[PDB]
Structure formats: structure tokens, C-alpha cells
């Protein structure tokens, strides 16, 4: 059962903004849980029922949870409902690879790939479809430990549902499976597609997929059989997995469970699968 | 609207290097169509950026403004070269260092008017410079200065109000707080930079936050510390700069207000700037 802890607005403080958009504002804050004497660094999101949906989804997958998925800590009931979450202090992986591009060994890159798969596999075990997997939404607790984040679009599938039919826009395209782009169908297999783009982002140390290409042409370009180029550091074995994730046939794409295994093999001998200058 | 002139590379030669770095190399040059002194930028991703810089310079060329360096055209060769007008006296950052002791307040405040006039034209043209600084203001005559270096400039779409960066590299000590924290950029973020630039002119070319590393500036600013009042500045002048450095972007002066204010001060230079020898 989904069980949301309600926090009092006197329990926690916003220290500073981390990011903002029309998705709302995310602050770093500190939280003293009532009846404890310690400060907990936390992230706080505020802007309406979308936020409650988000909270519900996060709490549905809380038990028994996974170390590679961000946990909801609770919610607060002000004018606007606020999401209180764990804080990943090193920021998103997108920005981390761009900033430390020249220090990132092959061990770390394949390690992140495994964790992301581990996290998404758990989500799938819990019948959750994320719908917004990307490197911007993989956050760094420590360089050695990353976590999937941003459940704003995430959906839970019922017992006899295999897909989710979406209604409307507000979806990032260059990360979307073709059948999501054309039919607004989303499944575990569509999240696999996104996982491919994500690994791509990591392997290019944070290049913008389909750069310069307008979003209006992507379904066209993908239908014609164009995909993201092989990253320089990637042996052909690595780039093959990515390519599998972008197959037209959803069921032909790898399953997160396989991805865990495959990347675990590679991470067990990283210099054999990625060629990075300085390893 | 925007037009790009392509010029015959064989019509000119690089006479000497004016300066260079990781941004590429600028030379003095001479264009002989069929003699015009010119300045020439080339480099060693980077190739796309120099075309972006050309596009942006071309996008604001008509009608242009006297206080904005115009793109004359591009040359093709192995790599794209940007041909600009040449400012024969160099950047203002240097000029106020090398003439510390012989600058009428009339000149100093005039330059602040012209800088603002150029920035306001850019703003009308929906361009955010992103790199305003004393180094990026060049002197054509003592009476004529121009904004330069569109290496980072960005245009806004008809219903965009801000530009969101990909991080990269940026001059932190000239940047608005919302640019350091959230890497947002607006005309009002340029107003911050203008503040710092005027600061550098008033201090005859001092290094802003000289000594502090760049990693610690956003803290100083968050706390509410700013650059010190310069010796030659009355309080009216310093108040102007300080308004540029306000946390609330929409509470900074607009370039149109800076033109008005500094023109007023220019009409009576000694009242606003105390300079020994005037
Ligand atoms: C890529 C930008 C980024 O993520 N930047 C960033 C992020 C964070 N930490 C953090 N920790 C948790 C959460 C989270 O799960 O928030 C829930 C929704 C309340 C977030 C976060 C989630 N979303 C959707 C965000 C959007 C924008 C910004 C953050 C989030 N973020 C920190 O913690 C210190 C810093 C940080 N930095 C410093 C900004 C850019 N650097 C990467 C350079
Ligand atoms: C402070 C450095 C400086 O600007 N020095 C300098 C500048 C110039 N003239 C000049 N004229 C035009 C341009 C220009 O618009 O170049 C475009 C991008 C092609 C430039 C110039 C532009 N950038 C970005 C530069 C970077 C470094 C150097 C110059 C530019 N510069 C001249 O022409 C006389 C001389 C000059 N001096 C010789 C260098 C130092 N003295 C001022 C002390």
C-alpha cells in the first residue's frame, strides 16, 4: 500500500534553488524529522494534482525499494503540495559527465550503466513505466552511486495492462521510442529505448542526441532507420546493445534484466569494452 | 534580412597577431578589393561556433549601430575567417591602463553612454551578448568606442525571454547571479556585466574581485557583497552600478535608462567624477 508521511512545514527549510522551469522549482533543503535531533539534506519540489500523482507513484515503489531509485521522504501541505525527496548532492549525471569528462574512467561509465539498469529493472518488477529516463534524470549520490529520479511522468500498470496510453503533450522526443512518438504507447520496452539514449549520453560525455535536428523530423529520421552514431570510446559490442534498444520491434529490444547482466560482464573488464585515453 | 558577405581571401593578408588563445586568433589585416584596415578571427564544434558568431553579427547588422563592431564578411579558405572593422586603438581595458593619468571625466562618461547605446541596440535586436567587459569594448577614435566579441552572443525567439546555457566556459566575475547559479541569461544579465565594465573603466582597469577565486564569487554575491566604490566615483555614479547588481533582474536599470542617466552625468562631468587634473 502507498503510505505518504505528512511533514509539517516547520520540520524543514529551503536553503537554495537547484533548478527551476515550468515543471516547478526544486530546492535543496534540510529536514529535522519530528522527534529526532539531526538534520537531513533533502530536495524539495513545488509549483497541481500532478504532484500528488508523482508522490503516489514514488511511494508505491518505496517497499522494498532499490539503492538506485530516489526515495520519497514525504509530502507537505501548504498552499501548494510539496514533494520532499532524498537529495543527490553531486547533481545530475548529464552535468557530471560534461564537467568531469576528462577524469572519467571506463570503470565508472559501465558501473553507472549497470546501476541504471538495476534501478529500471526494480521499477519494472514494481510495474512502473518511467517515461522520462535520461542522463539529466540520473542523479549522483556519490561518484560510485547513482539513482533514477524524476517520476513526474511515471505510470503504474494494472495487473492485466501491458502498456499505458498517454493523453496530450509535455513529453521529450529525442528520448522517446518510435511507437511512443507515433501512438503515445509506453511500456517497459519504451523505457529500454530511453535507456539506450541515456547510455549514449554517458558514452559521449554528455553530447545532445540528434543535435541540430528539429524535434519535428525525429519520427521521420527514426522511421527511415537513422539512429545515434557509435560513440568514439565504445567498442562495437557496447554500441550493439544501444542499437538493440532502438529496434522498431519493442519485444526485440533487450530486457533491463539482460542489460544488467551484459553491462555487469563489461564492467567486470571495462578497458576491454571502452577505450578511454588515460585509463 | 540577415546577409552574409563572402569576401575573396586573395584580397587581403594577415599583417600581425593582435591576440589569441583558446577562442582562436585575431589578426590585424589589410583588405585590398581592387587599402582597408580590418581585423581577422580564425581558430584551430569550434568550426560551427565561428559560423554562429557570423550569423549573429549578420543578424544585427541592419541597420546596425555605431557602437557595435560590424561584420564586414567571411573568408572561406581551409577554415572560416571573420572579417570585422579594425579598432586602431585597441580595447578599453588596456586604454585606461595605459592612459590612467590623462582621461577627462567627459571621456569616461561618454564611453559609458556609448557602451549603453550599443547594448540597447543589441537588446532591441533581441541579442544577449553574454560577454560584456572592458576588454570587449574597443576604441576607434577617443570619441568612438564599440562593443565587440560576439563569440558567446545569442538571439532570442519572438516569445523567449531568456537563454539557458549548457554550462561550458563563461567569465564568472562579469556574470549576474542568476547566470552563475541557474545559467540563465537575459538582457538584464548583460546589465550586470555593464555594471562591472563601468567599474573597470572607473578604476582605470582593476581586476574585479582581485584575489578571490571564481568558485567563491556566487557566495559573496548571495551574502550581498559587491565590488567596492571606485575612488573617482561620486555616490550618484556608484549607485548606478549597484542597481545593476541587484538580485531582482527586473529591478536592474534597463540600458535605455543607463543611456539617460550617464548622458545626464556626461553633460556635467566634473560634478560626477572627481579627477585630479581636471
Ligand atoms: C541536471 C541538473 C541537476 O539535476 N542539478 C542538481 C541536482 C541536485 N540534486 C537533486 N537531488 C534530488 C532531486 C530530486 O529527486 O528532486 C525531487 C524531484 C524533489 C533533484 C532534482 C530533481 N529534479 C526534477 C530537478 C530539476 C532541477 C534540479 C534538480 C532536480 N536534484 C543538486 O543537489 C545539490 C544540485 C544540482 N546542481 C548543482 C545544479 C547543476 N549542477 C549539476 C552543475
Ligand atoms: C585588449 C586586447 C585588445 O582588444 N587589443 C587590441 C585590439 C585591436 N583592435 C581590434 N579590432 C577589432 C577586433 C575585432 O572586432 O576582432 C573580431 C573578433 C575579428 C579586435 C579583437 C577582437 N577580439 C576578440 C580580440 C581579442 C584579442 C585581441 C584583439 C581582438 N581587436 C588592436 O588593433 C590596433 C590592437 C590591440 N592591441 C595591439 C593589443 C594590446 N594593446 C591595446 C595594448
The answer to the question of residue B71 being in a domain is yes
Ligand in nearest proximity to the CA of A24: 1
Going by alpha carbons, the residue nearest to atom 7 of ligand 1 is: A91
Is B128 in contact with B163 (CB distance < 8 Å)? yes
Residues in chain A: 279
Are the Cβ atoms of B167 and A98 closer than 8 angstroms? yes
Helix, strand or coil, per DSSP, at residue A19 = strand
Give, to the nearest 10 degrees, the angle between helix A256-267 and helix A106-125: 160
- Domain-located, residue A111: yes
Final residue before a domain boundary, out of B49, B64, B85 = B85
Length of chain B equals 278
Q: Which atom of ligand 1 is nearest to the CA of A85?
A: 19
Closest Cα to residue B47, out of B82, B4, B5? B82
Return d(Cα A152, Cα A168) in angstroms, integer.
14
For residues A266 and A110, the answer to whether their CB atoms sit within 8 Å is yes
Q: Quick one: cell of A224?
A: 527511415
Nearest CA to ligand 2 atom 7: B90
Residue A32 makes CB contacts below 8 A (sequence gap 6+) with A11, A12, A38, A39, A40
Domain of residue A187 covers: 91-272
- Residue B54 within any structural domain of the chain: yes
DSSP assignment string, B3-45: ---B--GGGEEEEEEEEESSS-EEEEEEE----EEEEEEE---
What single string gives the DSSP state of each residue in A157-202?
A: --TT---EE--S----GGGS-HHHHHH-EE-HHHHHHHHHHHHHHH
Pair (B257, B205) in one structural domain:
yes
How far, in whole angstroms, is CA B261 from its chain's centroid? Answer: 19
Residues of A in contact with B183 (CB under 8 A): none
Both B256 and B178 in a single domain?
Answer: yes
Which residues in chain B have their CB less than 8 angstroms from residue A16's CB? Answer: 222
Residue A101 touches partner B, C-beta closer than 8 Å: no
* Closest listed ligand to the CA of A47: 1
Same domain? For B161 and B235 the reply is yes
Considering the domain architecture, whether residues B101 and B215 belong to the same structural domain is answered as yes
Same-domain check for residues A56 and A107: no
Just list the catalytic residues of A: 132
Using CB atoms within 10 A of its CB, is residue B97 exposed (0-12), middle (13-18) or buried (19+)?
middle
B52 with B167, same domain: the answer is: no
A227 and A160 within one domain: yes
Chain A residue numbers with beta carbons less than 8 Å from the beta carbon of B182 are 17, 19-20
Name the DSSP letter for residue A82: E
Ligand with the closest atom to the CA of A42: 1
CATH of the domain at B50: 3.30.200.20
The residue among A65, A86, A107 that closes a domain is A86
Report chain B's C-alpha Rg in angstroms. Answer: 19
Tell me if A88 sits within 8 A of A140, measured CB to CB. Answer: yes
Strands (E), chain B: 12-20, 25-31, 36-42, 71-75, 81-85, 90-91, 127-128, 137-141, 144-147, 154-155, 163-164, 184-185
DSSP 3-state assignment of A271?
A: helix
Please confirm whether the linkage preceding A64 is cis (ω < 30° from 0). Answer: yes
Domain shared by B99 and B74, yes or no: no
Domain boundary among B44, B63, B85: B85
A148 beta partners: A69, A138
Q: Is A95 on the interface with B (CB under 8 A)?
A: yes
Task: Report how far residue B263's alpha carbon sits from residue B246's, in angstroms, rounded to the nearest whole number.
Answer: 22
Q: Check if B94 is active-site.
A: no
Query: Is residue B4 situated within a structural domain?
Result: no
φ/ψ (deg, to 5) at A79: -40, -55
Q: How far is CA B165 from the centre of its chain?
A: 19
- By the 8 A CB rule, do B8 and B73 touch? no
Distance of CA B139 from the midpoint of ligand 2 (Å)? 9
**Could you identify the residue written with the cell 542568476?**
B178
Residues B73, B94 within the same domain: no
Report yes or no: B249 and B186 within 8 Å, Cβ to Cβ. Answer: yes
d(CA B193, CA B244): 8
Q: How far is the CA of B14 from the centre of ligand 2 (A)?
A: 14
d(CA A16, CA A31): 14
Q: Is B196 helix (H, G, I), strand (E, B) or coil?
A: helix
Q: Which of A271, A6, A259 lies closest to A133, judged by CA?
A: A259
CATH of the domain at A170: 1.10.510.10
| Burial (CB count within 10 angstroms: exposed 0-12, middle 13-18, buried 19+), residue A194 | buried
B74 & B109 share domain: no
Residues A42 and A106 in one domain: no
Please check whether residue A278 lies inside any domain of the structure. no
With CA atoms as reference, report the closest residue to A185 among A201, A205, A161. Answer: A161
Question: What is the A21 CA–ligand 1 centroid distance (Å)?
Answer: 12
Looking from the CA of residue B149, the nearest atom of ligand 2 is 24
- Is there a single domain that holds both residue B96 and residue B65? no
B124, B131, B236, B268: the active-site residue: B131
Nearest Cα residue to B149 out of B203, B69, B93: B69
Query: Which amino acid residue places its CA nearest to atom 32 of ligand 1?
Result: A91
A1 part of a folded domain: no
Closest ligand 2 atom to the C-alpha of B138?
4
**How many Å apart are CA A151 and CA A128, to the nearest integer?**
10
C-beta of residue A157 within 8 angstroms of C-beta of residue A127: yes
Contact B166 A20 (CB under 8 A): no
Ligand 1 neighbours by CB, cut-off 6 Å: A 18-19, 26, 28, 43-45, 70, 83, 85, 87-89, 91-92, 94-95, 136, 139, 149-150
> Structurally, how many domains does chain B consist of?
2
Amino acid at each position: 500500500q502507498a503510505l505518504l508521511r505528512i511533514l509539517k512545514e516547520t520540520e524543514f527549510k529551503k536553503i537554495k534553488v537547484l533548478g527551476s522551469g515550468a515543471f516547478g522549482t526544486v530546492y535543496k533543503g534540510l529536514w529535522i524529522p519530528e522527534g529526532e535531533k539531526v538534520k537531513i539534506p533533502v530536495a524539495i519540489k513545488e509549483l497541481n494534482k500532478e504532484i500528488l500523482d508523482e508522490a503516489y507513484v514514488m511511494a508505491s515503489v518505496d517497499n522494498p525499494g532499490n539503492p538506485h531509485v530516489c526515495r520519497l521522504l514525504g509530502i507537505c501541505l501548504t498552499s501548494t503540495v510539496q514533494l520532499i525527496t532524498q537529495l543527490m548532492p553531486f547533481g545530475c549525471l548529464l552535468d557530471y559527465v560534461r564537467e568531469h569528462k576528462d577524469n572519467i574512467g571506463s570503470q565508472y561509465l559501465l558501473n553507472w550503466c549497470v546501476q541504471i539498469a538495476k534501478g529500471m529493472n526494480y521499477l519494472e518488477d514494481r510495474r512502473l513505466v518511467h517515461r522520462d529516463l535520461a542522463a539529466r534524470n540520473v542523479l549522483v549520490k556519490t561518484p560510485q552511486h547513482v539513482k533514477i529520479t524524476d517520476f513526474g511522468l511515471a505510470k503504474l500498470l494494472g495487473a492485466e495492462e501491458k502498456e499505458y496510453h498517454a493523453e496530450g503533450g509535455k513529453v521529450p522526443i529525442k528520448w522517446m521510442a518510435l511507437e511512443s512518438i507515433l501512438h503515445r504507447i509506453y511500456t517497459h520496452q519504451s523505457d529500454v529505448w530511453s535507456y539506450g539514449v541515456t547510455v549514449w549520453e554517458l558514452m559521449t560525455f554528455g553530447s545532445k542526441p540528434y543535435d541540430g535536428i528539429p524535434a519535428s523530423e525525429i519520427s521521420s529520421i527514426l522511421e527511415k532507420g537513422e539512429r545515434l552514431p557509435q560513440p568514439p570510446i565504445c567498442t562495437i559490442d557496447v554500441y550493439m546493445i544501444m542499437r538493440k534498444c532502438w529496434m522498431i520491434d519493442a519485444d526485440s529490444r533487450p530486457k533491463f534484466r539482460e542489460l544488467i547482466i551484459e553491462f555487469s560482464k563489461m564492467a567486470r573488464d571495462p578497458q576491454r569494452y571502452l577505450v578511454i585515453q588515460g585509463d
